[PDB]
Structures are given as C-alpha cells and as structure tokens.
Amino acid sequence: LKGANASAPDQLSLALAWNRVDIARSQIFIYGQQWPVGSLEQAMLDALVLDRVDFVKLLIENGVSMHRFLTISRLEELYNTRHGPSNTLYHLVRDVKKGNLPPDYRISLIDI
Amino acid sequence: ISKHTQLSPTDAFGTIEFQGGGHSNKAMYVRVSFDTKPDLLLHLMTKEWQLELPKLLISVHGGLQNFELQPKLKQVFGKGLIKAAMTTGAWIFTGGVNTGVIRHVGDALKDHASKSRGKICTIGIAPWGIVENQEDLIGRDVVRPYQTMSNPMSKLTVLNSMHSHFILADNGTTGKYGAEVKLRRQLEKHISLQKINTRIGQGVPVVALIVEGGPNVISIVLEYLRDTPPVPVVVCDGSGRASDILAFGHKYSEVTIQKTFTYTRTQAQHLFIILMECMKKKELITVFRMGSEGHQDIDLAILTAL
Amino acid sequence: VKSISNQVWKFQRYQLIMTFHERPVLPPPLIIFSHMTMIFQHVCRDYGLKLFITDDELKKVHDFEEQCIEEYFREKDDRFNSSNDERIRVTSERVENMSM
C-alpha cells in the first residue's frame, strides 16, 4: 500500500481485491483520508458486485448510506454482473420470456 | 455588527434519523435563541421530550480541535463514563459537534449500544452556525433524514450521532462558536438548583469531566470552583493538554520557569495566575491515573467526587 | 404421527376460517336465495383478511418491529458468548498466548 504511492481509492481497490478487510480497517480508514466525491459510492458498487459482505458493512459504517447509493441504473448494473458465485437467474429469465433471448441481453427490471 | 439580529420565531424542531453509520438512532432537536430562560428549557426537556429529572448531571469539557487518545486509556474512560451514566439515572452534557472529546463520547456510546440494553440521555448543546447543513433541518415537526458523512473541505462540522437530544442555540452569526457556553452553564446552574425526590433538601449533584483541553479549560474549571455551590471536577493525565497541566500542578502543592511550553504567547503571556487560583482550592480537583494511584475506574472516580 | 397431525390441523385451521368467512350466510338447503342476490349484484375486507392502519400506527408498528429484531439479535449474541464451548475455546486460546 505504501510502496504503490497511490490514492486512497486505489488502496481500497487493492484491499478489496485481496479480500482483506482488516488491512483496510487499520490502514486505509483512519483520520483525514479525503476521499474524492463519488469514490466510496464506486467502492460500494464494486464490493456489492464481488460479494464482499465485510467491505459492504465497513463502507456502510464509514459514511455511505444505501438510500442515496441505490438507483435504478445501479440496480440494473447489479442484476447484470458476471463476477461472483454462479446462479440460475438467466435460466429463469429465459423460461419466463419463453425463449427468443439473444446473447448479450440486458436483463431489465421489468423482466425481474 | 453590534448584534443587530432579527428576533424571528423558531423554524427548526423535530426528529432526525442519522443516515450514515450502521445504526438507526433518532434525536429530538430544537433551535432556540442564546438568551432563552432555562425554566422553559427544563420544561421542554421534562414534559415535551418526556425525560425524568436526573439523579446526576455530568458535564464533559475538552478541546474543540480534533485530538487522539492512546489505547488502554480510551477503553477505560469510555466504559467508565458509560457505566457511571447507565447505573445512575443521569444526563450527560456535551458540545454535540463531531469534534474533539465529543467524538470520544460518541464512540463510547457506540461501543456500549452494541453490547448492552438501555439508553443514555446524552444531550448535545451546539451552536446553530456550525452544523454542516443548516438546511435539511429548517423543517417543522417531522422526521428529517440526516447524513453523517463528513467533508473535510466544507470548513464546518457535522452533528455527532448517538446523541439522544440536541439544543441548537443561535445568535445570528454562522461559522463561529460562542453561542452556547452561556446557555449551557445557565442551564446547568438552573438544574442544579432543582430539587431531587429526596426530602432532605439536597439538589441534583453536578460533576465536571475534563479530557484534553485548552486555554479556556482552565477558565471554566476556575468558574466551576468559584461558584457558590462548588462543583467537583475530574481531570485526566494521559491527554497531554491543559488537563495534564492540571495533573502536574496537582503534584507539588504549596517552579515557575516551567511555564514555557510553546503553547501560548511565549513566557510573556502566562495562565499561571489562574492555574494557582484553581490550585488554591485543590480538595475539589480530582485526578485519574492508570495504575499509579487508586480509583482505576472512571465511574468510581466520578461517583466518589460527588 | 400424532405430532405431524397436530401441526397439520393447526395449519388447516386457517383454510377452515377463510372458507367460512367467504361462504353465504344461508345454509345450502336455502342457499338459492343468496345465489339470486348475487345475480342482482352482478348487474349492479375491513377485517377477516387484513387490518388497514394509518401512517402513525404504521410508524409505531415499524418501530416496534425494529426494537424486537434488535433485541433478538442481542439476546442471541449474549446466549452464544456465554456458552460453555465458547468459554472453553476462548480460555484455551488466551492460556496459549499467555504461556507464550
């Protein structure tokens, strides 16, 4: 973290990729870090996509409120993620829509 | 200007939900002028907010600027204060803004809420001109969402969460302190004269707790000691600021060239006169030291001082 | 079989109550009158299913539920921390560290 000489968003991204929450808690979240506007929101989106419950909890405790973060566009992005544990949502969408589903289809909230 | 302010009625009172950290803590608040009569404030806190009169009052003072406390001291200060205010029906008075000792009181309340039942009647008395959002609070009696995220570039500060009630005092200006010290001290004096349920005749006990501090901490300590009812105070040694100065002056009672600390206007300006005036009444000043002396518990130190 | 039957009967009480809340008041031998009334209403749930409440009562119910769930989690954590297995595990780890 120190040797990269990078910003706090980059350190948070590194600690999120390593899935190490104590590193972010004791080194990245300290007094006076001066995050850029919209950086904690992006980190929350990234932690939501990658199934990082500890980082979601840590970010919630450190300022970001889910009422402002969650929009329609962000929920649409969340439903169309490819990084994470396998699920069966695509088969359900194909079954409900009764076929006719081309590849790279965007699962709208109406389909959900 | 020469205090030329419009005396309009209040336009900010209700409840706020602190959106932010992992809690949902309501906080009833009002805005009142810095010249209000404490009888009305006590009536509000007793009947409208529905709070019983306290069996104990704790006043917490400290430095306005943000500082840090070493480990193994904050965990025995916060838990001691929480135990003292929980085992006893007590009201805690604090600055309210999320700076200085108020942050430590806030995290002490945060650590207790996740491990024990009950509630602590923490009361914040902050000037109205230092809240980071004067707007989003100018609504009438209705629940208002409030954000705990702090922007260091705003040159203001946010209200500390985990506070049960707020008294926001205004004098017209915006961005400077000094609109609540008179009101806070007058409310403390008025509630000290209030009669407890016991028919002996004793009033509500008042204690003062000092962590860190500044040049004005000596002044408020001397004001506490010089009141017609003396108010015992409790200081700490590990802070390093004027509280440590008081702790060092506790030793070797009745060394004047030691006043140079690169802290005030050289040796030309000195607070040694008021420090010695405080020390002339040393049976009221208490101190807390870790392991060096007795009373290794803050709640024991607070209760024995009363 | 006895326990399963008790549970299933307690479950089917809801279906019994809900099917007798909907039936016409008149019994089957003279239910033809109630069917003719439905014919007239063809050209024309305060309780029993739901219970509509105002916004203040809704907020009170929400606060009550939040208090209950917080109490549930706190009590569960307190039960877990004071079990003999957890006490033995924590004591063993602290004894190992203290010995080191």
Swiss-Prot record, chain B:
Note the effect listed for K72 to A/P/G: Reduces calmodulin-binding by more than 50%
Q: What is this protein called?
A: Transient receptor potential cation channel subfamily M member 3
Report where the shown chain sits in the full-length sequence: first residue, last residue, total length.
127 to 471 of 1732
The gene for this chain is: Trpm3
Q: List the disulfide bonds.
A: none
Spans annotated as Calmodulin-binding: 66-89, 174-197
Natural source organism: Mus musculus
Q: Which family is it part of?
A: Belongs to the transient receptor (TC 1.A.4) family. LTrpC subfamily. TRPM3 sub-subfamily.
Q: Which residues form the signal peptide?
A: none
On assembly, the entry states: Homotetramer. Interacts with TRPM1; the interaction results in the formation of a heteromultimeric cation channel complex that are functionally different from the homomeric channels.
Q: What happens when the gene is disrupted?
A: Trpm3-deficient mice exhibit clear deficits in their avoidance to noxious heat. Trpm3-deficient mice display reduced hypersensitivity to thermal, but not to mechanical, stimuli in carrageen-induced inflammatory pain. In the chronic constriction injury (CCI) model of neuropathic pain, intraperitoneal injection of isosakuranetin or primidone do not reduced heat sensitivity in Trpm3-deficient mice.
Where is it located? Cell membrane
Organismal lineage: Eukaryota, Metazoa, Chordata, Craniata, Vertebrata
Q: What does this protein do?
A: Constitutively active, non-selective divalent cation-conducting channel that is permeable to Ca(2+), Mn(2+), and Mg(2+), with a high permeability for Ca(2+). However, can be enhanced by increasing temperature and by ligands, including the endogenous neurosteroid pregnenolone sulfate and sphingosine-1 and suppressed by intracellular Mg(2+). Implicated in a variety of cellular processes, including insulin/peptide secretion, vascular constriction and dilation, noxious heat sensing, inflammatory and spontaneous pain sensitivity.
